[PDB]
Amino acid sequence: RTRTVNLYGLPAANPNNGNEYYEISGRFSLISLVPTNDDYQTPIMNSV
């Protein structure tokens, strides 16, 4: 009941569209720099 009709986009009035959530799936590749040792720097009696 208004001028602006047939416009492409998505207004903020009701974005949820009655849905609890919008979901997305994917893969997650991380190349972080751990502090982890290499089993050295550990005392000489490092054993059962």
Partner: protein
Amino acid sequence: ASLIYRQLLTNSYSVDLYDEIEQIGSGKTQNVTINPGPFAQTRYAPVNWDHGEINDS
């Protein structure tokens, strides 16, 4: 007086007790044996500087 040397040789076993005593007396340390294999130093990344996220409207 020749028996000094015989006596020292025969009684030499007491040096084990002496070694135990000095071992108990001495303070102690130890090692954390070092790692080899820093054969590949690693640079940060290919990094490029730019302005942040401008908030347009």
